[PDB]
Design a protein around this ligand. Structure first.
Ligand code: T3P
Length: 562
């Protein structure tokens, strides 16, 4: 007589209940009900729980002390007329819904898989208005990923215990992430700082106003001495020269707001401006989503539905005015970006959320509102000065219309160059030479790394976070002073893998694996055939590595005596 809606958390169950009628009975499963344990070897297969030699037959099983919830669910299902699987919208979630249906059992007709990217009244309505079917192709792409990760972990690690040291761990993508940090460590250690100088000048305008200049050219060539003498000979010529304005360029510039956030950008901005580490940002964003305050937090699309765009433009014109509203909406390009659920709920009205979780909502709110507001206008100015065989420059800027910057904290902005006409005489007041120093490549951070991971097509919205925490507790890299450092062991294992598992360590290849997984999700490839090909390439590599080193196997971490 009544429907049984299943979600995966108590917090999510509370919120979705505010939008489901009497005929619905929501229930969470407080976690994963079923999963994997914890030329073939039964010993191995059993521990892995997947058999790559008998066409990937698997052995799932109810998780620790979960046998009780399985019990409570089965009975709720028989008293129910229909069963609605409302797990999150990503692949992992499509898999967890699949497990709930496998466990409970019954006829496929008994189940529907609904989808939504935010838990609100109207969003729940459409979700349960035209429900959907479980998508086996997506489930398969998810298990494909899980199986190959198992293969690498459980079959490479044992070789490491034998060659390097017991306790070491291997990861299909984790090892590639550690490789990036190792290359960076080495470029930094090999960097040779170079010396170069700069020369500034303070002058007087005709009216007598101060003008600060910077030398740029000498004999119509860029200015860059390399020592103390070169700068001195240059400075000696500049003290005698006559200075005059060679040109005045006046032009209006603008600065647009950024697009609405995505998993990648949120982490980068939460870390750069708020000081929050990736893990912290993702644990808080999730609580906000499940509480009904923001849209799903795992995305890579900057789309905004017409409803959101119209509610925010409404907000913009009521609270800011006609001049901040663009003639037509800004279009940045089936998922949406990370944005507030209701623009009218402020960060300070957040009931049951704490300090930092509120600051993250604020950051998300501001970006969203800013992205639909007009550009900021400035008046830019450039003075080019001539002095004997030299040429100097000075730049300035004045704000005309704050535009989108209206919703950001009011400025603490240095500028304003005195009034001067092309041809006036400046008087020299003082010369200040300054010695500089080239700088070595900066060190990654949990920010720049997700960034780099995305840039190379290695990461993935739902994996970036765990990738960053994984490579950290195995002793390959550490975070001190909010920056990444490569440990010795990390360089030690990265060279070994790089020499006996070239394919697995290659950046292009692991990125192509992601495309392979997408192809399985879109029905353009069969999962088992894909696992077969990955396994075929994987075992060929693993065989060579197990041999003795004089046969071309992995090098032992030894230092043979005198
Ligand atoms: C869980 C997960 C989802 N996704 C994709 C699958 C979804 O699109 P698709 O319709 O291809 O299944 C989308 C959900 O946010 O992100 C990944 O690329 N990697 C993952 O690990």
């Amino acid at each position: 007589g009544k429907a049984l809606v299943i979600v995966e958390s108590p917090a999510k169950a509370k919120t979705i209940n505010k939008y489901l009628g009497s005929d619905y009975v929501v229930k969470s499963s407080v976690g994963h009900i079923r999963d994997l344990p914890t030329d073939e070897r039964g010993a191995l297969v059993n521990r892995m729980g997947v058999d790559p030699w008998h066409n990937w037959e698997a052995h799932y099983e109810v998780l620790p002390g979960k046998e009780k919830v399985v019990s409570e669910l089965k009975q709720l299902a028989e008293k129910a007329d229909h069963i609605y699987l409302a797990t999150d919208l990503d692949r992992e979630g499509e898999a967890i819904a699949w497990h709930l249906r496998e466990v409970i059992g019954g006829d496929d007709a008994r189940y529907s898989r609904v989808v939504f990217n935010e838990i609100t009244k109207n969003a729940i309505r459409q979700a349960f208005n035209k429900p959907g079917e479980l998508n086996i192709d997506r489930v398969n792409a998810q298990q494909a990923r899980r199986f190959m990760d198992r293969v690498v972990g459980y079959m490479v690690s044992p070789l490491l215990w034998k060659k390097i040291a017991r306790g070491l761990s291997a990861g299909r993508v984790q090892s590639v992430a550690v490789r990036l940090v190792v290359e960076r460590e080495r470029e930094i250690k090999a960097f040779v700082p170079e010396e170069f100088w700069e020369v500034d000048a303070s002058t007087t305008t005709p009216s007598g106003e101060a003008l600060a200049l910077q030398v740029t050219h000498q004999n119509d060539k860029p200015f860059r001495p390399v020592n103390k003498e070169q700068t001195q000979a240059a400075v000696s010529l500049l003290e005698k020269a006559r200075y005059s304005v060679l040109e005045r360029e006046d032009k209006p510039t603008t600065s647009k707001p950024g697009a609405p956030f995505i998993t990648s950008t949120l982490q980068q901005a939460a870390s750069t401006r708020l000081g929050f580490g990736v893990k912290k940002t993702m644990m808080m964003a999730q609580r906000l989503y499940e509480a009904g305050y923001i849209t799903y937090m795992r995305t890579d699309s900057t789309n905004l539905s017409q409803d959101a765009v119209n509610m925010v433009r409404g907000y913009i014109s009521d609270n800011f005015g006609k001049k901040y509203l663009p003639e037509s909406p800004n279009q940045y390009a089936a998922h949406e970006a990370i944005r507030p659920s209701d623009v009218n709920v402020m960060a300070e009205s957040l009931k049951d959320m704490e300090a930092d979780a509120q600051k993250l909502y604020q950051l998300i709110w501001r970006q969203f509102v800013a992205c639909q507001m007009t550009p900021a206008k400035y008046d830019s100015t450039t003075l080019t000065v001539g002095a004997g065989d030299f040429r100097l420059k000075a730049r300035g800027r004045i704000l005309r219309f704050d535009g989108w910057t209206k919703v950001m904290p009011a400025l603490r902005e240095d500028r304003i160059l005195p009034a001067v006409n092309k041809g006036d005489a400046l008087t020299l007041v003082e010369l200040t030479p300054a010695q500089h120093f080239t700088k070595p490549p900066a060190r990654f951070s949990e920010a720049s790394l997700v960034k780099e991971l995305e840039k190379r097509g290695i990461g993935r919205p739902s994996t970036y976070a765990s990738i960053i925490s994984t490579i950290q507790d195995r002793g390959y890299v550490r975070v001190e002073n909010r920056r990444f450092y490569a440990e010795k062991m990390g360089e030690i294992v990265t060279d070994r893998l790089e020499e006996n598992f070239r394919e697995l360590m290659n950046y292009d290849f692991t990125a192509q694996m992601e495309n392979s997984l997408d192809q399985v999700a879109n029905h353009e490839a069969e999962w088992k055939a894909v696992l077969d090909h990955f396994f075929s390439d994987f075992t060929q590599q693993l065989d060579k590595a197990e041999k003795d080193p004089e046969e071309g196997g992995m090098r032992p971490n030894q230092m043979v005596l005198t």
